[PDB]
From a paper:
Recently, [name] was found to be a pMBL6842-encoded type II TAS with the unique function to regulate the plasmid replication in [name]. It consists of stable PrpT toxin and labile [name] antitoxin canonically positioned adjacently within the same operon. In this study, we reported for the first time the high-resolution structure of the PrpT:PrpA2:PrpT heterotetramer and two forms of crystal structures of truncated antitoxin-PrpA2–54. In addition, [name] could also competitively bind to the iteron sequences in the ori, interfering with the binding of replication initiator RepB to the ori site, thus preventing the overreplication of the plasmid.
Considering the theoretical relative molecular weight of PrpT (∼11.4 kDa) and [name] (∼11.66 kDa), our SEC-MALS results reflected that [name] complex, PrpAFL and PrpA2–54 present an estimated absolute mass matching tetramer, tetramer and dimer, respectively. Like other members from the [name] family, [name] monomer polymerizes in solutions and crystals in a highly symmetrical manner via a local twofold axis to form a two-stranded antiparallel β-sheet. Moreover, the comparative structural analysis highlighted that PrpA2–54 dimers are similar to each other with an r.m.s.d. value of ∼1.38 Å over 96 residues. Thus, only the interface that existed in PrpA2–54-form II will be described in detail here. PISA analysis reflected that the hydrogen bond/salt bridge interaction network of dimerization interface is primarily offered by Met6, Val8, Asp9, Ser31, and Arg35 from each monomer together with Arg15A/B, Thr10A/B, Arg54A, Arg4B, and Asp26B for the PrpA2–54 (or symmetric Thr7A/B, Glu13A/B and asymmetric Ser3B for PrpAFL in [name] complex). The dimerization interface in [name] or PrpA2–54-form II buries roughly 1700 Å2 with the nearly identical negative ΔG value (∼24 kcal/mol) corresponding to hydrophobic interfaces. Except for the asymmetric Arg54A-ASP26B contact in PrpA2–54, the protein backbones of PrpA2–54 or PrpAFL project away from the dimer interface without further intra- or inter-contacts, suggesting the flexibility of PrpACTD. PrpA2–54-form I and II crystal structures both contain a doughnut-shaped hexadecamer formed by eight homodimers organized in a cogwheel-like form via inter-dimer interface dominated by salt bridges and hydrogen bonds. A circular hexadecamer (∼112.58 kDa) consisting of 8 PrpA2–54 dimers could be found in both forms of PrpA2–54 crystals. The maximum diameter of the annular doughnut-like hexadecamer is ∼80 Å and that of the hole in the center is approximately 22 Å.
Numbering used by the authors:
A (entry chain B), C (entry chain B), F (entry chain B), H (entry chain B), I (entry chain B), K (entry chain B), ...: 3 to 56
B (entry chain A), D (entry chain A), E (entry chain A), G (entry chain A), J (entry chain A), L (entry chain A), ...: 4 to 58
Write the structure that this text describes.
C-alpha cells in the first residue's frame, strides 16, 4: 500500500508540525519521508561495509 | 497521538524490512528512529544557528 | 504564491524523474524542495560565518 | 524543458532572495544549482553504492 | 523474547528521562536504540575486522 | 530500583549473547549498560550544544 | 553587466563540455558557478580573517 | 577561440574587481580562470568517483 | 583463571571508584574491563594495519 | 594500593599476550595503560562537559 | 615595481611550463602568482593563530 | 635557469616581507617554496588522477 | 635489559612529574609508554610504507 | 641530574636500536627523548583541555 | 649566520637527494625548509599553548 | 661524511637555540635532525602516492 498509521508521540508530532510551519516542508508526510531517507542511508552504509569486507 | 502518513511502496518495504530484521519491534519504532535522526540533524545544522541569531 | 515554473533542461529532468521512480520521493516538487534545502543550508553557513566574525 | 513546481512561499522567498543578491540571474538558475548539489550528494552516497553492487 | 537487566539507579533514571521526554515510547525502545548503536560500533570496529581475517 | 525487564527481540538477544560468548563482557547486563552509555553520551552532546548556543 | 574574458582554448572546451552535459544552460552560468565557488573560498579563508583583524 | 563574453551581474563583477584591486590577481581574466579551475577540480572528482566505482 | 590482582596506585583507584560512584558502572571490575577493551581495540587496529600492508 | 579484578579468561589471555610481546613488563602495567586511556576518554567526553555546566 | 627575476631551476621551470601547456594557465607569471597565494594563505593562517592566542 | 615574472606590487611586498622575516634567504627561495606547494597540490589533486586514467 | 639515557633536566622533571601524579609507577613505565607511542607512530607513518615497497 | 637508567625490555631495545640503525637518529638517547616529547605533547593537550573548560 | 650540524650519513644522503631532484638549490635551503616546518609545528602544538597560559 | 655547515639566518638560529634552551632538545644538531625527519616524512608521502597510483 502507500499509507501508514504510526504512533509518534506528542513531542515528535510537535517537531513535525514545526518543520511544516517553517515552510521548508509541505506535509507531515514529507517530513516523515525525509527522516526515513536519513535512516535508510545510515542502514545502507553499514550493509555496504558488510558486503565489502566479505 | 497517531499520525497517518503517505510513505509510498518502496519506503514501506524498507520499513517492513527493518522490522523483519528484528532490530525494531513496530513500524512506529522505525518512524520514530528516523525522526530522532532528523531532529538531531536539524538542531545541529547551520540554518538553525543562523535562525537563532535573529534575537 | 506557491507555484514556480522553471527551465530545468532535459538531463536534470531525467534526474528528477529518476529519483521519483526510485520511490524515495513522491513528486517532482519534493525533489526540487529537497535540493533547495541543501543550497539553503549551504547559503546559511556562509552567512553565519559572516555574522560571527563580525 | 519546463517544469512547474510547488515551492510554498518560504522557499520561493529564499530563491528570490538569492536572485536579489545578484549571485544568480534567474529563479531557474537557483533551482538548477540546488539540483546539481542533490545529484552530487546522490552519486556520492552509500545508498547509491549499495544499490550498484546488486549487479 | 524478554530479558531482565541490572541497570542500577542512575542509568534507570537516564532511561526514564528519555521516555519522559517523549522521543521514545517504552523503556524497551531506549534499550534497543542503545543496542543498535552498540551493534553498529561493533561491526565497524577494527577488532571485528582483525577477528575476521583469521579465515 | 536496579532491575529492568525489557523486550529485546530474538536477534538483539543473539547479539548480546554473542558479545558475552566472545568474553569481552561478563553478563548480559554489562552489554546493556555499555549500550546505554553510548546513547547517554550521544544524548549529552546534543544537550550540550543546546546549552552552549543559549 | 557583460565582461569579456580570456579563457584560452582548454578552459573554453571545459565550459562548453559542462553546458553540453545539460547541468548548465549557458556558458555564463558556468562562469557564475565558478565565481560563487571562488567567493565562498575567499570569505572562508584564513587570509580574509587575518585581513579583517587590522581594524 | 580564446575570448568569451559573459553575463556576470553587477555584484559578481564587483567581487572580481575587488580581487584585482587587492593585488592578488592581475586581470579580471585571471580571477575567472581561477574560479574555473575550482569548478573543474570539483567536476573531475565526481567523475573520478564514477569511473572508479565502475 | 578469571581473577587478577593488580597494582593500580591510589589515584587510579580513586578514578575507578569515581566511575562506579557515578552509577555508569557497577563494579570496579566493569571499569577495568571497559579500559581493557579500549586498549584491545587500539592494539587490534595497529595489528590490522600490519596484516593489511603485508 | 592493590585491587582484585574479574577479567574472565579471554581478557586475561589478551593481557598476558601483551606482556608476552614485551612492550609491557607486568599485567599491572597493561591495566594502568587501559585506565589511562579510559581517564582520557572520560575527561574529553561530552558527558563530562555537560555534567560540569551544572555549577 | 612589478617584475621579478628568479632562479627557479630546470625542473621547476619544466613544472611551470607543463602547467601552461595544459592550458589551465596562460603565462608563467600566472603559475608563479598562484603558488605565491598558496604560501601567502599558509603564512596568514599561522599569523592568525598567533594574533588569536594573544 | 632564470625566469622573469610579473608579480605586481602587493605580492612583491609579500615576498620581500617573508625574506625580511629571515625564514628565507632570497626572493627566489620564496618563489621555489610556493612552487613546491603548487606541485604537491597538483600531484595530489583529483584532476591529476582523472587525467591519468585515460591510459 | 637496562638502558642508560641522557634525558637532560627538563625531561627528567617531566617524567618525575608524571610518576608523581600517580598514573605511572616507575620512571621506566613512563619511558616505555613513550616508546610505545613512538613505535605506533613509526609503523603508521608514510615513510615506513614507502620503505616497504622496495621489495 | 641528566642521566637515567631505565628497564626497557629486550623488544623495545631492539626497536630503539633499529631506529638508530636506520640513521634517522644518532643515539639511543635521541630516540628516548623523541618518544618523551610525544607523550609530553599528549599530556599537555589533556591538561590544556582541563584549564580551558575551567 | 652559519651553523655546523651532525646529520649522519643517511640524512645527508636524503638532503643531497632533494637538491639533486632540483626542487631545492642548496643543502641550506633544505635545512631551512625543515626548520620552517618545525617552527610551524611548534607554534601550532598544544604544548606551546599550555606553556603560554602560565602568564 | 656526517658533518654539514649550513646558512640558517639569524632568526632561525634563534629558533633552534630556543628549542635547546627549553630542554626538549640537547644540541642544535638534534633540532636540525628533527626538522629533517618532518620534511623526509612529508616527501615520502608524496612519493608513496606516486608509486601507488602507478
Amino acid at each position: 500500500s502507500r499509507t501508514m498509521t504510526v504512533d509518534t508521540g506528542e513531542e515528535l508530532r510537535a517537531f513535525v508540525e514545526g518543520l511544516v510551519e517553517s515552510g521548508d516542508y509541505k506535509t507531515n508526510s514529507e517530513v516523515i519521508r525525509d527522516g526515513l531517507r536519513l535512516l535508510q542511508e545510515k542502514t545502507a552504509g553499514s550493509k555496504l561495509a558488510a558486503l565489502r569486507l566479505e
